[PDB]
Write a protein that binds this ligand. Structure first.
Ligand SMILES: *[C@@H]1O[C@H](CO)[C@@H](O[C@@H]2O[C@H](CO)[C@@H](O[C@@H]3O[C@H](CO)[C@@H](O)[C@H](O[C@H]4O[C@H](CO)[C@@H](O)[C@H](O)[C@@H]4O[C@H]4O[C@H](CO)[C@@H](O)[C@H](O)[C@@H]4O)[C@@H]3O)[C@H](O)[C@H]2NC(C)=O)[C@H](O)[C@H]1NC(C)=O
Ligand SMILES: *[C@@H]1O[C@H](CO)[C@@H](O[C@@H]2O[C@H](CO)[C@@H](O[C@@H]3O[C@H](CO[C@H]4O[C@H](CO)[C@@H](O)[C@H](O)[C@@H]4O)[C@@H](O)[C@H](O[C@H]4O[C@H](CO)[C@@H](O)[C@H](O)[C@@H]4O)[C@@H]3O)[C@H](O)[C@H]2NC(C)=O)[C@H](O)[C@H]1NC(C)=O
Lengths: 368, 364
C-alpha cells in the first residue's frame, strides 16, 4: 500500500550488500599488496640470476642465464610500470566506488531506521506495517547491517551480492498498489515513502516530481502508489544514466587488476610463445643480420633442448643451489640463493659481486 | 523555525565539502603514481651505475660507484617494500574514507533537494523559508554541488574544506528557536527537519529518539526546535563516538603517505649523515675504527658535503650507449635513458659482454 514501511524482503538485500561492500577497500589493499609482492618476486629472480652470472663469468650457461636475467628484468620492470599506469587506478577506483555507494546506502537505511515514532511511524518493517525491525548491535533482526565502514586492512570480500552480472539479490518492482515491497495498511506508516500530500510526506501539494533515492535505486512517487525499486540484477549501459553510482561500483569491481594477471606473473606455455622470452632472444642473442625464419624458436631449442616450458628449470635450479658465502655483503652465514628472497638483501649481494667482478678484470689485466 | 528549510549558510558548506571530497580518490591515484615513479627513478639510477660498472671494469671510481649502486638498490628495494607494507594502505584508506563520507552527504543533500512540493515544501532554501535554491546543472544557488563522483584520474584536490585541523567551513549550532540555520516561518516548510508530530514529520507520535543524519553531523529533534549541527571545526577523539565517518576521513587524509616521504626519496645531508650510505660503507667497503665510515666517505668523495657525489653521477650520466646494444636504434647517454625496461635490457647485454671479456682474457 502507499506509505507503509519497507518489508524486510526489500531492505535485507541492502543490508547484505552494504556488508559485502564494507570489505572491498580491504580486498583492494590485499590485491595491491599481492601485485607488488609478485613484482618483487620477479625482481628477486632477476637478482639471483644476475648474482650467479657475476659470480660465474666463465659459466657454460652464459646465454641461457643472460636470457633468463633479461626476461625477469623485463617482467618486473614492465610489471611495476603497468601497476603505475593502469593497475593501481583500477584498485583505487573500485575501493572508492564501493565506498561511495555504501555511503549512500548506509545514510538512507539509517534515515529509514530513524523515522520510528510510536505505533504510527515505522519505516523498516518485517512482514506487516506494524512491526519494526529490531536493532541489536550491528544486526537488524537476524541480518548483519552495520551502517559503518571498517578499518582498511587486508580482506577477502564476499562475491554474492555484487557479481559479474549485477546485484542479484536486490528486488525490483513496485510502483502500484500490489503490496509487493510495502505491506497493506494497518497502523504503522512511513510517509517518507510517498510524495503525495493526502497520506504521504508533503503538506498540501504533492512533490513537484518523483524523488530518486538510494543513489537512483528507489523512486518515491508523487502519486498514491508504492515506491518503485529498479532492476539492478542485470546491470548494463543504461544504468550509467539511471543509477550511476550502482553502475560505477559494478563496472569498477569487474575491472579490478589482479595479482594473477598477465602483467604481474610469469609467462606460460612453450618457450617460443612466451612473448617477452622470445623478444629477448632476438634482442640479446641473435645476430642483427639474421636471415632465418623462426630464428628465435631455433635458438631456444639450441639453448634449452626443446620448447617445453619446463626446459628452463635446470638452469633456474642451478641458480638456486648457488651458495653465497658468509662475508659477502656483511652476511654472517652462508646460504644458497634459493633461500634468500629479500630484495634489499639480494641487491646488496649483487652490488658486492659486481665490485668483485670488476676487481677480477683489473687483476687479470695486471697478470697480463 | 522548527521545520523550516535549511539556509544556504548551512548547506553550501556541505556542497563545498562534497566538491572537495570528489577529487580525493584521484589525488590518491596521483600520489601512488608519484611514489612508484620515485621508486622507478631510484631503480633507474641503480641500473645506470650498474651498466657503467659492467662497461668500465677498470674504472678508478670502483669503490665510489659500487657504494652508489648499492645505495640506490637499497633505496628503491626498501621503498617498494615500504609502499606495499605501509604506504598503499594509507592511500586506499583515505580514498575510501572520503568516498564513504561523500556518499552519505550526497544522499542526504539529494533527499533534501528532492522534498520540494509546491509552495509548502522546500528543504534547501536561500535566506527565507519560501525560496528554494535553484539548480543549474552542477550548481545549486550558484555553488558547485554535483551529487556525483567523477572518474578516477590523477588530480589535485583542494584543501580548504577538510584541513589538517578539521572541517573549518561547516556551521555549528541550532537546537532551539533562534532561527539560526532554519529561517522564521512563512509558507515553505521542511517537515523532515522536525521529528515532532504537531508540525513536523511524524503522524500523532513524535519520533522515539532524536535522529542523527549526515553520518552524525546533523541532529533532527523530536521536540519543537531546530535541527542541531555538530562542531566539526577542530576534529579530535570525541568525534570517534559521534561522527565516526567524519573522524575517519579527517584522520585518513592527515595520514596519507606521500611521494616526498623519506621511504620514497633520496637521503639528504652530509654524506656521513645519510644512514643508508653510511651503513653500506661498512657492508661493502670496510674490512676488519671509530668514525670509520665517515673517514672512508671523506676519502672516497673528497669531503662530506652532500654534492660530493655529483661528479661520479655526472660521469655515469655522460656514458654513451651506442646503437646496437639491446637492439637500440640510436645512441644516447645514460642521462637521457630513463625507462627501467630499457635500462634492464642494457644491463643484461653489458653483463653478457663483460663475461665474454673475462673468458677472452683468461683464454689469452
Ligand atoms: C635520486 O638521486 C639520483 C641521482 O641523482 C637520481 O637519478 C638521476 O635522475 C635524473 C632525473 O631526475 C637523471 O637524469 C638527469 O637529469 C637532469 C635533469 O633533471 C640532467 O641534468 C641530466 O642531464 C645532463 O647530463 C646529460 C647526459 O650527459 C646531458 O645530455 C644533459 O644535457 C645534461 O648535461 C648537462 O649537465 C651536466 C651535469 O650538470 C653538465 O656536464 C653540463 O651542464 C651538461 O650540459 C640527466 O638527464 C639521472 O640520469 C639520474 N642519475 C643516475 C646516475 O642515474 C634519482 O632520480 C633520484 N631519485 C628521486 C626520487 O629523486
Ligand atoms: C617467476 O618465476 C621465478 C622462477 O621460478 C620465480 O622465482 C623463484 O621463486 C621461488 C619460490 O619463491 C624461489 O625459491 C625456490 O623455489 C623453488 C621452487 O620454485 C618453483 O615452485 C614454487 C612452488 O610451486 C613456485 O612458487 C615457483 O614460482 C617455482 O615454480 C624451490 O625448488 C627452491 O628450493 C630448492 O632449492 C634450494 C637450493 O637448491 C633448496 O634449499 C631446497 O630444498 C630445494 O631443493 C626454492 O624454494 C626461487 O629461488 C625463485 N627463482 C629464482 C631464480 O629467483 C618467481 O617467484 C616467479 N614469480 C611469480 C610472480 O610467480
Amino acid at each position: 500500500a502507499e506509505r507503509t514501511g519497507l518489508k524486510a524482503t526489500a531492505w535485507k538485500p541492502l543490508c547484505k550488500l552494504t556488508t559485502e561492500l564494507s570489505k572491498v577497500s580491504g580486498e583492494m589493499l590485499n590485491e595491491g599488496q599481492e601485485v607488488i609482492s609478485n613484482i618483487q618476486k620477479i625482481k628477486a629472480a632477476e637478482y639471483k640470476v644476475s648474482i650467479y652470472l657475476a659470480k660465474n663469468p666463465e659459466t657454460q650457461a652464459l646465454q641461457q642465464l643472460t636470457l633468463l636475467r633479461g626476461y625477469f628484468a623485463r617482467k618486473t620492470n614492465g610489471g611495476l610500470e603497468s601497476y603505475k599506469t593502469m593497475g593501481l587506478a583500477t584498485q583505487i577506483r573500485s575501493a572508492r566506488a564501493a565506498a561511495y555507494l555504501k555511503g549512500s546506502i548506509d545514510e538512507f537505511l539509517n534515515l529509514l531506521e530513524s523515522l520510528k515514532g510510536g505505533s504510527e511511524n515505522k519505516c523498516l518493517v518485517t512482514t506487516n506495517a506494524d512491526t519494526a525491525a529490531t536493532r541489536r548491535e550491528t544486526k537488524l533482526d537476524d541480518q548483519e547491517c552495520a551502517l559503518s565502514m571498517p578499518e582498511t586492512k587486508p580482506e577477502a570480500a564476499t562475491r554474492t551480492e555484487l557479481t559479474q552480472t549485477g546485484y542479484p539479490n536486490l528486488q525490483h518492482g513496485g510502483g502500484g498498489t500490489a503490496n509487493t515491497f510495502q505491506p497493506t495498511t494497518s497502523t504503522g506508516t512511513c510517509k517518507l515513502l510517498s510524495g503525495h500530500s493526502t497520506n504521504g510526506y508533503p503538506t498540501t501539494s504533492a512533490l513537484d516530481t518523483t524523488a530518486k533515492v538510494l543513489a537512483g535505486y528507489m523512486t518515491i512517487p508523487n502519486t498514491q502508489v508504492e515506491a518503485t525499486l529498479a532492476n539492478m540484477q542485470a546491470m548494463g549501459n543504461g544504468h550509467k544514466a539511471t543509477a550511476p553510482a550502482w553502475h560505477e561500483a559494478w563496472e569498477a569491481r569487474n575491472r579490478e587488476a589482479k595479482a594473477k594477471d598477465l602483467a604481474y606473473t610469469n609467462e606460460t606455455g612453450n618457450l617460443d610463445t612466451q612473448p617477452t622470452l622470445k623478444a629477448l632472444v632476438k634482442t640479446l642473442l641473435l645476430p642483427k643480420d639474421n636471415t632465418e625464419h623462426n630464428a628465435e624458436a631455433t635458438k631456444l631449442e639450441a639453448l634449452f633442448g626443446g620448447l617445453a616450458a619446463d626446459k628452463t628449470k635446470t638452469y633456474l635450479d642451478m641458480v638456486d643451489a648457488e651458495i653465497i658465502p658468509a662475508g659477502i655483503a656483511g652476511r654472517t652465514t652462508e646460504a644458497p640463493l634459493g633461500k634468500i628472497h629479500d630484495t634489499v638483501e639480494l641487491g646488496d649481494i649483487l652490488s658486492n659481486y659486481e665490485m668483485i667482478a670488476a676487481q677480477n678484470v683489473v687483476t687479470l689485466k695486471k697478470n697480463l
